[PDB]
Amino acid sequence: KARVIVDKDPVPTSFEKWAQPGHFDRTLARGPKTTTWIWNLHALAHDFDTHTSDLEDISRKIFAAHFGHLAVVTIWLSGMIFHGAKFSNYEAWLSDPLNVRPSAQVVWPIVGQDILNGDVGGGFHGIQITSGLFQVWRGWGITNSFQLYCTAIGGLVLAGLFLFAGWFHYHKRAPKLEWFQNVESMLNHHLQVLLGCGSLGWAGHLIHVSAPINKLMDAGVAVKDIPLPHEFILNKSLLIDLFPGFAAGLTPFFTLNWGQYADFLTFKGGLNPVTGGLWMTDIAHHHLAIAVVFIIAGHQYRTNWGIGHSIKEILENHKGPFTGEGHKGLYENLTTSWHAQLATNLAFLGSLTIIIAHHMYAMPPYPYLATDYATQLCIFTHHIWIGGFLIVGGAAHAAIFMVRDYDPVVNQNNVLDRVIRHRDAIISHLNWVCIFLGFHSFGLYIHNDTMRALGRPQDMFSDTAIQLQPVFAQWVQNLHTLAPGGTAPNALEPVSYAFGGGVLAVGGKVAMMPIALGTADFLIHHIHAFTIHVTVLILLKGVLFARSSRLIPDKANLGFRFPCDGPGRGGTCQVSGWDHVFLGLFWMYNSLSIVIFHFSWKMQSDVWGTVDAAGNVSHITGGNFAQSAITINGWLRDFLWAQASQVINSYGSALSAYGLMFLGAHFVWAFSLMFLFSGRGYWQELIESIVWAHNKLKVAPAIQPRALSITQGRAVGVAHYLLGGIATTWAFFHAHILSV
Amino acid sequence: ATTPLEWSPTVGIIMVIANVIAITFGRQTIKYPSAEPALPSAKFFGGFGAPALLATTAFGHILGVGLVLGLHN
Amino acid sequence: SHTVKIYDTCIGCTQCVRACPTDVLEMVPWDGCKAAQVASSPRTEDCVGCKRCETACPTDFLSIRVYLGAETTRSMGLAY
Amino acid sequence: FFTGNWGVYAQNPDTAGHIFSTSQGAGTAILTFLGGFHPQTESLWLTDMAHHHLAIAVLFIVAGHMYRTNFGIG
Amino acid sequence: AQAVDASKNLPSDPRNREVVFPAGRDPQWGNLETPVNASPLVKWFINNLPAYRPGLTPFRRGLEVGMAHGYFLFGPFAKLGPLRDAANANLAGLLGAIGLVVLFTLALSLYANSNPPTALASVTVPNPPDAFQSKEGWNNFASAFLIGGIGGAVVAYFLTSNLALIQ
Amino acid sequence: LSGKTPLFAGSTGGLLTKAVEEEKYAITWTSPKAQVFELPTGGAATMHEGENLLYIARKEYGIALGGQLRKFKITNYKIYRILPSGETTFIHPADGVFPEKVNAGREKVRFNARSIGENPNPSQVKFSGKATYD
């Protein structure tokens, strides 16, 4: 039933369809009568559901499309490791990581870029990167350039190998539908092999290669003296001297005498004092534990041998009193719509990516990461934004599933139909929460801003005045500090020093210290929840009311993406499921841009800084977060006006491009306001008068010009609005820490 | 760093016992124990096939590994 | 409430009457001996100004027009 | 208790020379298993009675959930 | 196989019993009967509140409503208002609380003079509430809210100010 | 009005206070088979074997539902307008023929014999109460 069925020679491989544009769609295949045909050519290129009503052809296109995408990611990664080999200071960073900055680029000696090739240490003049690959490759044990050179070539070979697969599958050997619908086989294979065995094999690296290499390097031996990884396998005397657990061999493993391997499989639960980062042995014990869990977890499902569940069975049983049939029918939707799968995967993968960034800063998992304050903010800020984008995509495809693939027969009194039937109560109460919080979250800032201007500093919501202490977070914080003793007693240190413990000092820099929570930190956590709630209100409303509304009952027939119904009914503007996503992106932004500042200003103020040998820490901004982060003027004064001094003064230095990129984004941003505020009606009339001038001089175009569509105008704006916003704070974050 | 273990024959007894719990837990619970790969005797092995054998034995090792280590505090 | 005016350039496509959600329009026989039919707007109180008919009419400029006017519960589409 | 290091409550018991309703020879333990008669009163140790009803209430609550009251479990 | 899988379709299963029902017998209606809306506990509480209690005059309803609100509104002005740390802190709460009662009574009589449409019926309160469907009933309600609201705030002032003597 | 209500548990979206006070609507149709159909406002419902009836807030929901019924090949959809006093009028089709198909009984109304470009300028009809389109 999970057999492999493959069609042979589905489609040829001729070049003629390249010459024929718009072949995928019938309307576009006719010809380009107007300029909107051009914009529609791109907007429908990847929408395979519109090209064909056949699910099998859609699935084959998607499966092959992923392979070409992996080629891009591998090529992007293969070039990263390549720049580390040739155009980089990696070999110098290894010997002196603290006092040498990481660089991987060399601008050429032309019109005047050469100032950007600044002195980053190690005899290399180049741009100071912030991706942290130097910390990654060091954890991988890559101690020379040739080891780095060989890895780049393998990615390109792996890249073309992925590319050959999509050709082999779409043109020569196409799997049929039933091969794709075997979700049970898919989950087992990915859980056990991709996630399980991939983690298990990586533990083989940590145990044989990285931890011996890292344990030597941090002990003071030069990279010249460090043996290569292969020598550890052949000669075990070098390894046994570092990790004596290997003298027993593999016999303690099978005899369950796993205490013999305690030397190199630890539960220290803390950062290495020498190199700011988690212990490599803890990361070896990490992956080995998780691989067994993933290997075990994948045998749950049936796959042709009668041993395992049917996901259809489990869902149907989970009905209850309040939910009539519960999860009956979801397996059909999930197995008959790619959009539903994309919605679940995007939404949780995006929430996953946000969860990574919160972990990576508190417990740095690489050597010499926390000392590089530049990398931590850029690494934190990057993933925080990626997850926000993907979560919004999850709501979009949730609506596309509804307008397109929702069958009322399947969804009859199930958990989904029962949700659509009381959508008004869900939104009305969520509307109340958004108004409740926005008053009592932002209004408190206004009250403090009003009182501090009135000259009444005792009436503010502050630490000295009326205080709103996060006792529940202070409560949970205290448990993790006292955990290593009582709960999970095998741990020596607390899980993260962010919760509590003692200041860890790598060189002169503090890697991590306890993050105290006060009224100012109370005043920001809810601002995220408030902005997150509104983002859900816009997006959730888009999913439920996409099919119908009291204003429009036939919203489904119009489609997921339509601008309006018309002027009447008071106005039907931005009513589609598409336009909800267009609005949610602005709130996905405002939800997210405060998160990166709450991380940026706090860590500079309370955590990041320089420490003296005596034990006195001098933070970067000196505790200004406590009293200034409770008023809107303090953010404008102490965070935006103050920290942006390096950017504007970056001209005539290596950071001068950040001053340009910080500024060019402001242009691109306001350029967005053209398309959001305006409307097509003005622009087509203006183009009409301009067309007359070309008719006069006989320069009239054959493809008759047309203004951008209504949905496109909203689309082009949010593209600029976000690109101008993110690119602005991108350079501000870079130039501030790269100087500080 | 837990203390060493010497691989006594008592550990072999616990593993055999832990399997027998899984096997009794398997037959009374598994819906489709029979499978395509058939075993030589349909009495000494019951209605189980080669998949159900590896399944019941595998869950037994999980329990036996937990018990042997759990008892070894 | 609204006023839907139908002009002389109709040709009897029957597309306007189909696109109307509220059934404001109707195709009636025209006294023209060789004119097959022509549209009408008998129940104008139920017009909801969505301009779907204006999008449907295929004349060079629209034989049918919907001029906005005094609003009411029906025209504003208020179920409440 | 909530941590789980329950043995602390039985650390310092009432000495044999304890005089009832006084602090002479007293202790701090609230649960013990001395298992015998108080010397002075010629009666059972009261700390055991506190420990006594604890273990019984745990079994009784555990014993209660056998049946199929409304939810189907039992 | 477990019996839980077989019993999912049977109506004897505790799952299949449904708590939610349509509003009344007509499912076309807007509301949905829920244990929050239509439980006997909530129905008893809401229907017996002063706004819905049977056999009460409009003046008696506002007095019960006002005495509660007057007693409630004293707190925020006293402890959290200005002059909260002073000898006259409790006095400022009495004036500010009565201030809202005047503004609240104004809105009541103001809403009253404008012809109020109706008092609606819902699942929690099936019958029409009271004679709140006329200017005369709402006006008497407003005058009663004023008397109770001024009295309730005075009571909270007397107890709060003289709490130490009560101890 | 005679018919069986489609079977659905209920929904927040539906009739509101307007229905009691102002012109609730009702749609009627006869089915050959009991089928699952999406309601005009949220959810799904099962039509009965014959003579279905559904109470509706706005006329737009009924005609929008009728287009869905035509997918199931049910063309005998009838709509009514129910005032609070109980007055029910055969509102959607005034005569048995549908609006699309011509019938002799009907008469043209709001027909402008002029072309649209031949309309007068508004300055010619200012301070008169006349409108250009009239």
Ligand code: CLA
């Ligand atoms: C070996 C050469 C080769 C040839 C001759 C063809 C030929 C064909 N393929 Mg095919 N294909 C190939 C390789 C090839 N393919 C490979 C390697 C894959 C795996 C990814 C696929 C996957 C694939 C799919 C999934 C589909 C086709 C389709 C088609 C047909 C139409 C394509 C067309 O006109 O659009 C030509 C389009 C381009 C030339 C643009 C492609 C751009 C590339 C792939 C991505 C570039 C990314 C780039 C880095 C982004 C930078 C952005 C920024 C810098 C601006 C045509 C018969 C389609 C079809 O049969 O329609 C029914 C179809 O659905 N192919």
Ligand code: CLA
């Ligand atoms: C796994 C990720 C993923 C995948 C596979 C898809 C796939 C799809 N999406 Mg989708 N989407 C995603 C994530 C994803 N989305 C996310 C994260 C969001 C939220 C932002 C959305 C929001 C979204 C909307 C609102 C819509 C889709 C639609 C679609 C479908 C057609 C799109 C199309 O024709 O492509 C072609 C797309 C384009 C040509 C747009 C180009 C956008 C460019 C890249 C923006 C510039 C960004 C760039 C980085 C800027 C710097 C460089 C520049 C200056 C040069 C297709 C099924 C459409 C639909 O209706 O589905 C049927 C639709 O209307 N998506």
Ligand code: CLA
């Ligand atoms: C700074 C600009 C700004 C502000 C203040 C708001 C405010 C709001 N938007 Mg919003 N919005 C904006 C820009 C803004 N928007 C932009 C640019 C867009 C386009 C992307 C949107 C798109 C948008 C959508 C799509 C949605 C909102 C929603 C909301 C509401 C959320 C509820 C809330 O916070 O409680 C109210 C809080 C405030 C108004 C904050 C200030 C209030 C202070 C504390 C009190 C004032 C003091 C005092 C009473 C003044 C009395 C003076 C007296 C003399 C009269 C709120 C009304 C959501 C909504 O309405 O649902 C609830 C929603 O769904 N907005």
Ligand code: CLA
């Ligand atoms: C929305 C956020 C917010 C909050 C929480 C506060 C809070 C406060 N402000 Mg303030 N203020 C705000 C916004 C806010 N402000 C804004 C936006 C401005 C600019 C216009 C000001 C300007 C301002 C000034 C100029 C002054 C204050 C003052 C005060 C204090 C006294 C409050 C008072 O007398 O009201 C009394 C409040 C009430 C009578 C009612 C409050 C609501 C109750 C608690 C609702 C409870 C609902 C309940 C839980 C539901 C029951 C459920 C049921 C089923 C039982 C207090 C700390 C004063 C001060 O000096 O501060 C120390 C003062 O002089 N405010």
Ligand SMILES: CCCCCCCCCCCCCCCCCC(=O)OC[C@H](CO[C@@H]1O[C@H](CO)[C@H](O)[C@H](O)[C@H]1O)OC(=O)CCCCCCCCCCCCCCCCC
């Ligand atoms: C906010 C508070 C949260 C509250 C959450 C708890 C709410 C309580 C939920 C109670 C659940 C009731 C279960 C109903 C199923 C039995 C009904 C039934 O048909 O009976 C199935 C049968 C009895 O069934 C009877 O069978 C008869 C024929 O024999 C007839 O058919 C009767 O009609 C039928 O009732 O047996 C059971 O009742 C026992 C089944 C085993 C139930 C195990 C419960 C434990 C499940 C734990 C879930 C595993 C995951 C936990 C770990 C997760 C890790 C994160």
Ligand SMILES: CC1=C(/C=C/C(C)=C/C=C/C(C)=C/C=C/C=C(C)/C=C/C=C(C)/C=C/C2=C(C)CCCC2(C)C)C(C)(C)CCC1
């Ligand atoms: C649990 C619960 C709850 C809670 C409750 C509450 C919290 C209550 C409230 C409370 C209140 C709110 C109270 C108040 C009271 C008051 C009073 C007690 C009053 C008094 C009065 C008086 C006594 C007055 C008198 C007078 C007058 C009238 C006039 C003249 C003067 C005088 C002063 C004599 C609820 C229901 C929510 C829900 C469910 C559960």
Ligand SMILES: CC1=C(C/C=C(\C)CCC[C@H](C)CCC[C@H](C)CCCC(C)C)C(=O)c2ccccc2C1=O
């Ligand atoms: C400006 C604007 C327009 C008009 C925008 C237009 C017409 C953009 C046109 C962009 C390019 C530059 C058109 C020409 C592309 C040529 C192919 C470029 C020449 C080729 C060389 C560059 C190689 C809208 O249509 C619109 C619609 C709805 C809301 C807001 C707006 C809006 O703000």
Ligand code: SF4
């Ligand atoms: S021209 Fe317009 S109004 Fe006339 S028949 Fe065609 S669609 Fe109807």
